[PDB]
Amino acid sequence: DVTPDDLWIVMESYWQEKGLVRQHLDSYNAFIERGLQEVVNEFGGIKPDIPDFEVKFGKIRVGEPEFQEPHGQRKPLYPMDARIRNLTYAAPLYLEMIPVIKGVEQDPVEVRIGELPIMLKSKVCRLYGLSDEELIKLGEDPKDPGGYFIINGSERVIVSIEDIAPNRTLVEKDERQEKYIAKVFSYRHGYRALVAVERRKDGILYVDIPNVPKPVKFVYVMRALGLERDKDIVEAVGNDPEVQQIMFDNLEDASDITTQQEALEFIGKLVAPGQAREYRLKRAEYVIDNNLLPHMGVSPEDRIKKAYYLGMMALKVIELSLGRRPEDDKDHYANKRLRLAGDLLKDLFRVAFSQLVKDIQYQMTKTYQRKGDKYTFGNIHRFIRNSIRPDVLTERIEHALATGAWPGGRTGVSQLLDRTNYMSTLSHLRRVTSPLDREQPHFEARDLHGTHWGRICPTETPEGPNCGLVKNLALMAQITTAVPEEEIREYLMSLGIVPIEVRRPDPTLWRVYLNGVLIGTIEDGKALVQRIRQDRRSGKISDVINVAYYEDVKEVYVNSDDGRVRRPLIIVENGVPKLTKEHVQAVKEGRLKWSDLIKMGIIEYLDAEEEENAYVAMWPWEVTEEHTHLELMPAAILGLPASLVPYPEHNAAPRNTYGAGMAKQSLGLGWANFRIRVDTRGHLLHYPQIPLVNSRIMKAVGYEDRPAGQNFVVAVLAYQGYNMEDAIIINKASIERGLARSTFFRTYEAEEKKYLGGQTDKFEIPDPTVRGYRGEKYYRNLDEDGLIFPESKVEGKDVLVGRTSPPRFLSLQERRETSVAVRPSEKGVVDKVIITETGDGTKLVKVTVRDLRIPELGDKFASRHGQKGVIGLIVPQEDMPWTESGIVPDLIVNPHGIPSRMTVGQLIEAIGGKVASLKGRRVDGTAFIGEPEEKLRKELEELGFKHTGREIMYDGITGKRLEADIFIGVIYYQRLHHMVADKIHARSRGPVQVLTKQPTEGRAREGGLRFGEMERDVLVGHGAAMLLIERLLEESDKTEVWVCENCGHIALEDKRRRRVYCPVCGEEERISKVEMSYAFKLLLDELKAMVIRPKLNLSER
């Protein structure tokens, strides 16, 4: 019999063979292979408005990642080259134009339609298939998983959107109007159409169609699709006596309409009021063709199947009305589908290619009109070639990927890749985001659904308004990719299904749905699902096919679409798992791989639909004949950062969430490539260490090669008042010996722009003549070429790159000083200087400044159990207490937060760390199979210490032992990137904003702190009127104006005549001085910008 360790041996092979970013790579590969051709075939070809001429599309292909040098030719491009040069890692797209003249094709011509950005490490990327010693020579980190885009030197990652499953009939209750509604989202060529059929209180069905003002009668719209016979309606909806009675009632209520043409004219009246009869008829038939369930087709022949689908929807509604079926429960996973990178990129390419074909057609029409005819027909090749505008496609694709603003209203799909450390990057590469609005409560959507088990991490979620709406895939999660639909349909047809066109859904007969559309009916559902399961396990069909049956409604569902989230499971047959010991041995020896286990029928992936029929056991020793599957590794249900916490089951859930969130913020050697990286911000821990108590998953995922913390000797004691309220106390000597010492990086950028008209910038030492010339003190560290010397120490606002710009016409014969300087409050040493050329050939200089960051007061430290704090005091070593066995704490924490936080796992890790450090080998801290507490307690006693982990210490000041035994151990602690050196900020006077004349915003530009209206209300509540006026007028904005008390209008002061006069009424006698905020004067001007006339009445005193 197998043991959990044997199952772990199999489990790690899955990550070894597949990786961690399969969801992006597989989707992008499928896109490149098929989606481009699909989108090209959708358009068919260009139809220019030229007599007897037409263009038909051919094949499309992707070249290689290249770059067209401005003063040169196309050359190979590499990701590190693109990162530094701010280029776009893209490959050209080649497409075949087939000219059709006189309705006859001829030899095709291949043209370049644009550039497509390349996902890193995809099958078309240059880094694919390379070894570690080659990636190193290319400047890449071998641990880099790839799966992101590089746009203008920035790393963009596409997160997966979590939409509702397409072509799904979901039924909900409209209790507000006491109705029942069924909703479907029909997709065709990216377009979405929400079609709904509802039953109101009257018991009459109505159908909602896009681009239709008011819901039409159900029988009327069905009549519009042919099938006018009343008996045909009754048979299409169903056969049940109550169903046919309700349909008799509806038909009696719908006896007003007679034929399909009358319904068409009625819809024409609905859609095109006031227009000609023929126009309304045609444009309503258009709506019927391509707005009513387009996924069934748009052909006029598609009437009957659309009618059958609508009838089944109506049957579902009325069945819900009778209580024969429950609600849809759209929170269930079967109704949810992920939008992967490939699908979104296909949509973007679709819209961009539509724009491109419009532009091409316009260009050819113009050329034929203006050049002539014999020119175009003489050289068709030139006429086609010199009319394509690839920049139209490239600009839109690049901008859409860079900004994150997506066509169709989607926003935030593409985010800047987080590069703080290893865990943050990998976690960012695996995210699922809900498309809902953050501001609304959404209590039903934010909740953790029961089906989330094994598909979404239960703990790794954001803290603020995004809580529950942003989620991360679990480790067992696998995302499917669609197989061809027609082959699956034919295979299902060959198994004995009769087409739906043959016989009606007799309740004696099961219904069969393929990806949500009814395709036929079978006599037995269970026999069909067993038959399909046997082929799927044997290997006759692809593994992506999932089949489930619902006994109550007699329906069989077959899923083969894209974007489902599944988990692997061991198949249990007759109470005996199909996985045997020799299979584990073969996996260990490398003879047998995970894919072989998949093909051997030992392990299969289950989506949400199929898992409804399953009964999975947790452990091998609790399997019986009833069970159908066995859990591979329960500890793998957690996400990637959540797996870091040792013994997570001993902590309260909020604390585990905090620890998992903070694990993505700590410093460490994120990547070995950091030295030549050009990231805006960066960090580097000087002495990273492997955690002594760790989960075996982290070694498999490669985290131990890039650790992000250190082991501290921690004593739980209330040393002073300096550690209360989650503050911590740290030893000075340990800090001086290299504990938590870190380095901070920041990269500055400077372009030598070339303006229109020939004027350009220049790198040089700014002469004293130029305007804006800052003090000579700040040019102390510049070379004659205008660049700073590396390894020279700089201070605040010191110039790194000297540069002058062409003057501004208010002066003349001047050069603006536009040097790039260090941020006003930063300090460090210049590390490296890089000179490159941009995409346009202009010089580009990047300078990185490194700064040592010794731990100080206010720096934030957090353990992985969610316990966080700041350094409250730095104590000399001789003041710290010492254990009678010769140990001095590296850190002291307050014993007060422990009971309230209920993080027993941290207390267990404290024992485990010292046990591991004393026995000479690390301790396994896996989630549910780690070394138990009782074993560690006995082992600690074996080594000579006390089993409670308490040691006798002597007070460091009085030199006598404390009264109570003190708990002391070793705990992994992480330094967070929230350092006080980046948060401190003070403004004396600073500059002011142009419009409101108030202090600027942010630390970078010497901004001022926000004094919110709540602070004003607090001031009022204290009754301090003069303090309020001082804070609100002098410190921010105040001015004096001239007010004419005769008419209230603000008077004009002329500095030419030293005179004040009122323009609106010509008054000079009574012009009093008024003191007010500048913002209120702006408000008065804004009101006078409208027709508002605010008159001002003055008063004395």
């Binding site: 089951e649 739980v716 350094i871 207390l907 549910f928 009264e963 006080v980 921010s1036 004009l1052 605010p1094």
Partner: protein, 901 residues
């Protein structure tokens, strides 16, 4: 000399006013030429002002930072309807005759309604009701009473479309559209005598002004262009919209002059109307908002005045201020509660202007000599004439000798200065208080720990702002009203808000518990550390073996109390009521018991103090903790704020020293229950599970009794939950009883320093039921939460009951259920914060301006009396004795003990 704005009267700008107040007429749809100068006659003409450097506005001279701005105007080719007045225009049109322009009312009814209006129409709601009644009356008359003429109905189509349903031949209407010129002509002939009947005013407004023919142009300084880093001028949205408006107007004028077809002119008129209504309000209902080149919606005049980032709430009610600093906070128990530690880097950046006088000349001279780099230096000097000089190394001695009476020095911060110290969100009035500056070397603000509860701050990364008042009156206000020691008692419930927390309470319990004793060196060191000015130790309480003297904790603690304080009560450690009852009887029989008689009956659960001598009880959250503080509450009322501050500082330091040098820790063995307790807990859990199973079995065969009003399933769920809650409480009952007072976690929980019994019973015995929104977990597969259970299982374990503790570890199903439980709390806090904030904003705006007058009444700013006596008794809740208007028992008792002494 200087006057103030006494009142503001609103109205509608007339075309004459717009023309006269304007400085230039705009005719060119462009802003800047090729080189960069403003184009003459453009939307950026220099007549309106200058925004570019090195340019003089010809209207008023000035410069970029000096010229305030001047209004322009556009002569519209044809009138357009103002979008803000369209609904009012519709209201007016359907209530007046088309021919004579008079109100379609009868004269005696007009007289009655004019009499009604004059009866205090200033109340807006009543005026609106009267006007609505007039509108309804005038709607339903087809024929004018003043003149004989039929009136057709008018249909309003949003945003500014008016239809006239006028009949034609064969009795059929054709819904004639009313052009803006026709509407203006109709409105113009309305007499002034009946304008008040329409809600308007004959002077501040006119009906014909609501249809505008000339459009004012905002000044250039109100439309600041931003020179982008690429070198391209980034025009403001308003400027672009004005350019579009001018272009459309010019095209319309050219077409009208050229005799264009009627349809083209109508289309151009509609386009101009659309452009104007978008410029005034881009979020107007019924129109597609104009979009920028990037596709974003433009922001227009209506957008600037609305929203949290708009003018009113973003730049008027609140704004960014100078002389402010922000950094993280770190604990410091060694400073007084009314002091804040300030980094030396911040102190040399912020300055406090000070005037030179005869009593501070030498100190200011020394600071000026120190320069702007030594810590006690200065950055600027202001001569009496008002010129500003920056202190530099070449000017130190010369400026120091120039310094005399009447000069101003912008010195660095000092010890004893007053600053404003704030944490966001500012939920309540003691979120901002004034502190005394105390300079510090490092880069974090130091805050005393007893002041944390008012700020709701913990040292886990929180940042708090600091403000420096710049004027003497503001400094006096901060010093007198906003001192920290003034706000010890919370105004919400009349109890202390500042008090000992966590280690303070724990150390107090350790010091005052029974059996605590200290040696000579410990007593001397702790008294010196606390700051007590003692010069002679009291008599030893007991003598240890080897002849060493020992002092009890009661004697040491009694040295901090006022000499004549007397009080008795019951603390949270009371467990045997007979012991407390005996002490209460002994005190009641004679109001002054013999101390040597009390010491025989001394019990930790009953605190009793006699003339400053602590005779019984132990320190607890009731002693000086913020919520239940009594000693602090008595001291602050009977001895003033300063004595309370001294007492608080001394007790905090003493308790911190005690907890430091006695040793206080918690470990993995604090939840080590004996085997019998584990067996008892397992027995309880099994009994509860069996009861739940029996209930489910009874339900499945229809034998369950349906509870009143509920469905049978709901009755089953409620009974199951009651059983499970009872089971968890029963487990906690033994978990508490087996962990004695000697456990440090139990000490932390019972004294109220941190945590409660629920945490202990969850860590040691049982987690119990997990539920979402008050009901058991159901949001899984069909009939089951997890696929690891059989469908239809209603058992306790299968629905969320977790039988393990945090110590023993959770099985994966229990872990998933616990995560389900925690997510609800997270989202609950996330939503509740925003809801509470919005409700508080509504309340603040409702009740802001009420105040207590000199006569004791609370009056609205309009003079309306809200209360004839504030709080109906006249007592400030902050000064009240815990809600009570006055504590009679305390006064009688203290008077009797004072006089019987």
């Amino acid at each position: 000399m200087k006057k103030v704005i006494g009142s503001i009267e609103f109205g509608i700008l007339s075309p004459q006013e717009i023309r006269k107040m304007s400085a230039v007429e705009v005719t060119v749809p462009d802003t800047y030429d090729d080189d960069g100068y403003p184009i003459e006659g453009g939307v950026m003409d220099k007549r309106m002002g200058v925004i570019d450097p090195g340019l003089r506005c010809e209207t008023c001279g000035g410069r970029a930072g000096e010229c305030p701005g001047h209004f322009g105007h556009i002569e519209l080719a044809r009138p357009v309807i103002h979008v803000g007045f369209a609904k009012t225009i519709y209201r007016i049109l359907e209530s007046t005759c088309r021919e004579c322009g008079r109100i379609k009312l009868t004269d005696e009814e007009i007289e009655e309604y004019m009499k009604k209006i004059e009866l205090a129409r200033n109340r807006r709601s009543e005026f609106n009701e009267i006007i609505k009644e007039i509108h309804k009356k005038a709607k339903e008359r087809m024929v004018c009473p003043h003149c004989g003429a039929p009136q057709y109905p008018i249909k309003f189509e949003k945003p500014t479309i008016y239809w006239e349903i006028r009949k034609d031949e064969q009795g059929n209407e054709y819904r004639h559209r009313l052009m803006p010129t026709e509407v203006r002509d109709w409105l113009e002939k309305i007499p002034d005598k009946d304008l008040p009947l329409l809600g308007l005013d004959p002077e501040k407004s006119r009906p014909e002004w609501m249809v505008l023919t000339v459009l004012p142009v905002p000044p250039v300084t109100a439309r600041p262009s931003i020179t982008l880093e690429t070198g391209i001028r980034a025009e403001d949205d308003l400027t672009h919209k004005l350019v579009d408006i001018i272009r459309i107007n010019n095209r319309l004028k050219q077409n009208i002059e050229a005799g264009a077809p009627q349809l083209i002119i109508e289309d151009l008129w509609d386009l101009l109307q659309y452009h104007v209504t978008t410029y005034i309000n881009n979020e107007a209902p019924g129109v597609p908002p104009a979009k920028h080149k990037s596709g974003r919606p433009l922001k227009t005049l209506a957008q600037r005045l609305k929203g949290k980032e708009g003018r009113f709430r973003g730049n008027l009610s609140g704004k960014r201020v100078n002389f402010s600093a922000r950094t993280v906070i770190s604990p410091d128990p060694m400073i007084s509660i009314n002091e804040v530690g300030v980094p030396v880097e911040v102190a040399m950046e912020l300055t406090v202007p000070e005037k030179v006088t005869e009593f501070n000349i030498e100190r200011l001279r020394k600071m000026v000599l120190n320069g702007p780099d030594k810590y006690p230096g200065a950055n600027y000097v202001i001569d009496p004439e008002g010129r500003r000089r920056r202190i530099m190394d070449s000017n130190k001695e010369t400026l120091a000798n120039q310094l005399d009476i009447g000069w101003t020095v912008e010195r660095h911060l000092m010890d004893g200065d007053i600053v404003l110290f704030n944490r966001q969100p500012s939920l309540h009035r003691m979120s901002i208080m004034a502190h005394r500056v105390r300079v510090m070397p490092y880069r974090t603000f130091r805050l005393n720990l007893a002041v944390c509860p008012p700020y709701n701050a913990d040292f886990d990364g929180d940042e708090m702002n600091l403000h420096v008042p710049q004027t003497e009156e503001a400094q006096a206000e901060a010093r007198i009203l906003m001192e920290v020691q003034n706000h010890i008692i919370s105004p919400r419930y009349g109890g202390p808000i500042i008090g000992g927390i966590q280690d303070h309470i724990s150390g107090g319990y350790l010091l005052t518990r029974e059996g605590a004793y200290f040696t000579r060196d410990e007593v001397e060191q702790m008294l010196m550390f606390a700051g007590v000015d003692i010069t002679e130790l009291p008599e030893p309480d007991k003598y240890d073996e080897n002849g060493n003297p020992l002092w009890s904790g009661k004697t040491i603690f009694s040295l901090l109390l006022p000499e004549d304080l007397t009080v008795w009560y019951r603390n949270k450690l009371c467990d045997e009521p007979e012991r407390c009852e005996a002490l209460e009887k002994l005190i009641e029989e004679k109001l002054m018991p013999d101390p040597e008689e009390v010491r025989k009956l001394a019990y930790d659960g009953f605190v009793y103090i006699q003339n400053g001598k602590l005779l019984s009880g132990a320190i607890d959250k009731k002693a000086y903790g913020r919520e239940d503080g009594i000693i602090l509450d008595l001291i602050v009322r009977e001895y003033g704020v300063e004595r309370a501050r001294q007492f608080l500082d001394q007790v905090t330091k003493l308790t911190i020293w005690v907890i430091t040098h006695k040793g206080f820790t918690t470990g993995i063995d604090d939840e080590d229950l004996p085997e019998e307790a584990r067996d008892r807990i397992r027995e309880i859990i099994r009994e509860a599970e069996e009861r739940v199973n029996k209930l489910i079995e009874a339900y499945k065969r229809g034998e369950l009794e349906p509870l009143p009003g509920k469905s049978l399933e709901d009755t089953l769920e409620s009974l199951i939950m009651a059983v499970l809650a009872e089971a968890r409480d029963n487990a906690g009952a033994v978990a508490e009883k087996y962990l004695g007072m000697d456990n440090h976690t139990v000490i932390m929980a019972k004294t109220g320093a941190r945590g409660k019994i629920l945490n202990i019973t969850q860590m040691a015995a049982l987690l119990g039921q997990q539920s979402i929104r008050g009901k058991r977990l159901y949001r899984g597969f069909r009939g089951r939460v997890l696929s690891h259970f059989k469908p239809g299982d209603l058992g306790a374990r299968a629905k969320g009951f977790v039988v393990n503790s945090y110590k023993s570890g959770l099985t994966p199903q229990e872990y998933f259920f616990h995560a389900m439980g925690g997510r609800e709390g997270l989202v609950d806090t996330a939503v509740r914060t925003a809801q509470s904030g919005y409700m508080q904003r509504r309340l603040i705006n409702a009740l802001q301006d009420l105040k207590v007058e000199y006569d004791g009444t609370v009056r609205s700013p309009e003079g309306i009396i809200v209360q004839f006596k504030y709080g109906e008794d006249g007592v400030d809740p902050m000064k009240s004795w815990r809600g009570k208007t006055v504590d009679v028992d305390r006064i009688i008792v203290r008077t009797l003990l004072k006089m019987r002494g």
